[model samples]
Target: ACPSQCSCSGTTVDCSGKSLASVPTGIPTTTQVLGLSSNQITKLEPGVFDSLVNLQILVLYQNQLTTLPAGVFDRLINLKELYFSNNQLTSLPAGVFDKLTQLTRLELQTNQLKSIPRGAFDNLKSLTNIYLFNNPWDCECSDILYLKNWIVQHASIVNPDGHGGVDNVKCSGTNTPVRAVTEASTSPSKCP
Candidate 1:
């Protein structure tokens, strides 16, 4: 009953809601779309995804992951859509996402992210829609300056999803809900 719960259809593998504590092996190397969301996975070992070179879409949402080791996702060059939302990630390594150049949609909402390193998403030029709301973003210059600038500079690529859509990246500890800081408001004045 191991891979039995996992359903494989051509290039897609559906392993969601299996109550899995760790990623089950025997996932075919030919798999392109791997869905491991709604599981109990805590940590992903290094090179756990190295063999899936043909992988494109990876869904690991709603897990118990706290931190990811550096270079864990370096081998997935052809990846396009990555979903890691609804997890316990506090922070990501500086270059954890530098290798996923083909990434278009990234879902990181509802996590415990307090701060993120600069240049983490610099290489993802193809990124169009990124859901970053609902995180504990530190409304400080050092914490949000780069991301604010990036959001403003790349506003054209950011999907507004209606509702004015200028800067939708919301933050906590502040009365206003806006994206990136500017000359008018560099730091969140109300953040304590």
Candidate 2:
């Protein structure tokens, strides 16, 4: 039986706004889409979604998630779009998206992310559109420098004109809030 809070139809499962504190189980392995957005899920344990290898879209937006265990998404190789926006994610484990080679759109805006891990998107060659605004980003020249440089170099991948606008992506932990685009265009010496 599917989770009491979820409604399963064919290959899709809709559990949005369920106020769930954790990922639900009993979902069919054939399920391709899982909508668990707008819930109260605070964390995702490892292997919570391992049974759904065919999952293509996962919506976890507007949740209270602060951390995700490593390998939690390692089984979702067929995933195409992932939504983590409007959550409380402070940081993502390295290689979290390494197995999601088919992913094209990723939403990470409106979180508490301060920095990105090295090689986090190393295998996401198909990634094209990314949302990463409204976060308390650290614009230090130490760790965030790599992310700022990469984001600018990969401007074609992250949509600059969609939704709230990627051009407005900013960084804090500085004397003055700096737009990511600004740091991306200038040398590290200009990061202050």
Candidate 3:
């Protein structure tokens, strides 16, 4: 059965711009495209998409969400594109996205993320594009170590969305680009 607030067509469930406060229940497990974008939904509980194993594209962008539960997305092994931008997420838990081996594009561009936890994106073997600009990236050697290295490692795939590259993704306090920070190579005296 399709949730009353959403429209289900074939393998797609569209609940975008529906003014929802929370995700509707009874979503079909066979659903491949779950469109919940441009809603007011905030705070996702773990296992929210547990049943949607075949989900290909999950759109949660343009919402008011502030925090993402640690285990909320570990079950989506087949997710291809994840639109999690334009929200208020401040940080990502370690290994939060290590399970989505098939993920191609990750939209974490316009958020409040300050740090990318170690091992957070190490297992995304099939990832080809990731939008991570436009966030408050802490450039402190310790905080930016993992993400800086990851950005340099995957320079070809990062920030391929709208505009900008590693040169445009700046650190919070110093207005320094992540590219420059990683190139400096000199360790700071105080991490904090």
- Sort by lDDT, best first: 3, 2, 1
Predicted model with the maximum TM-score:
3
**RMSD per model, one decimal:** 3.3, 3.7, 2.3
Off by over 4 Å in 2: 164-166, 173-192
lDDT, candidate 2, 39-141, per-residue tens = 8888788789999999999999899988889988999999999998999998888888889999999999899887788668779889888888787777654
Off by over 4 Å in 3: 182-192
> Which ten-residue region of model 2 has the weakest summed lDDT?
175-184
Listed in order, each prediction's TM-score against the native is 0.86, 0.87, 0.91
How far does residue 3 in candidate 1 sit from its true spot (Å)? 2.7
After TM-score superposition, what is the CA distance of residue 29 in candidate 3 from its true location, in Å? 0.4
What local lDDT score does residue 136 receive in model 2, on the 0 to 100 scale? 75
Candidate 1 vs candidate 2: which has greater TM-score? 2
Please, what are the lDDT tens digits per residue for candidate 1 over residues 1-192?
Answer: 236778877889999998988777777888899999999999998888988889999999999898998898898999999999899988898899999999998888788886668888989989988777677766654566666677677776554465234455665577244464454555546433
Q: Taking the tens digit of each residue's C-alpha lDDT, what string does model 3 give over 1-192?
A: 888999889999999999998898889989999999999987887778888889999999999888878778878889999999999888887778888989988889899887788878878888888888889877765667778788887788878755676666778878887766653553544343
lDDT of 2: 0.80
